[PDB]
Design a binder for these strands. Structure first.
Ligand SMILES: [Zn+2]
Ligand SMILES: [Zn+2]
Ligand SMILES: [Zn+2]
Ligand SMILES: [Zn+2]
Lengths: 74, 76
DNA sequence: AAGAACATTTTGTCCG
DNA sequence: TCGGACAAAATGTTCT
């Protein structure tokens, strides 16, 4: 289809199992491969759009997981 | 408390009128000069502390202004 | 589709 | 106190 399931920007393909833009693709890989310690400054329900996805990596990562992203998709 | 009034990190001086840390000092200068247009992804009430201050420039910048930071603190 | 390298943006430290 | 340069972290794009 058309839109990233994580941030609603234009998708570039099906990455890690889910339709996402390229920025969310590489965010999720880095998140999964790094150490998890992200902390929301809100209530763990930040809105994640094209502009606001840079705000909260904790909620952006929860949204990647909720969308079903996983490194071993293939 | 030698604490930054914006994020509670260790303050380094009175910058632009307010006891703040090095990071909040330059963040504030950068926000006004670029006349930045920040948007909160919460509720306009994010927690701003040493770690989370990176997460919402909108609430960080709001706390700066509200604490009374002002580029013309001296001129004043 | 996915990984890597390059690029950019955003933030933070150190001087003077 | 304040500014500049440098440095680092965080995000994003191109893969001639
Ligand atoms: Zn996305
Ligand atoms: Zn959040
Ligand atoms: Zn501060
Ligand atoms: Zn906020």
């Amino acid at each position: 289809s058309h839109m990233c399931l994580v941030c609603s920007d234009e998708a570039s393909g099906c990455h890690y199992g889910v339709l996402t833009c390229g920025s969310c693709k590489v965010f999720f890989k880095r998140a999964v491969e790094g150490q998890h310690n992200y902390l929301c400054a809100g209530r763990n329900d930040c809105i994640i759009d094209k502009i606001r996805r840079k705000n909260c990596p904790a909620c952006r990562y929860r949204k990647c997981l909720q969308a079903g992203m996983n490194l071993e998709a293939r």
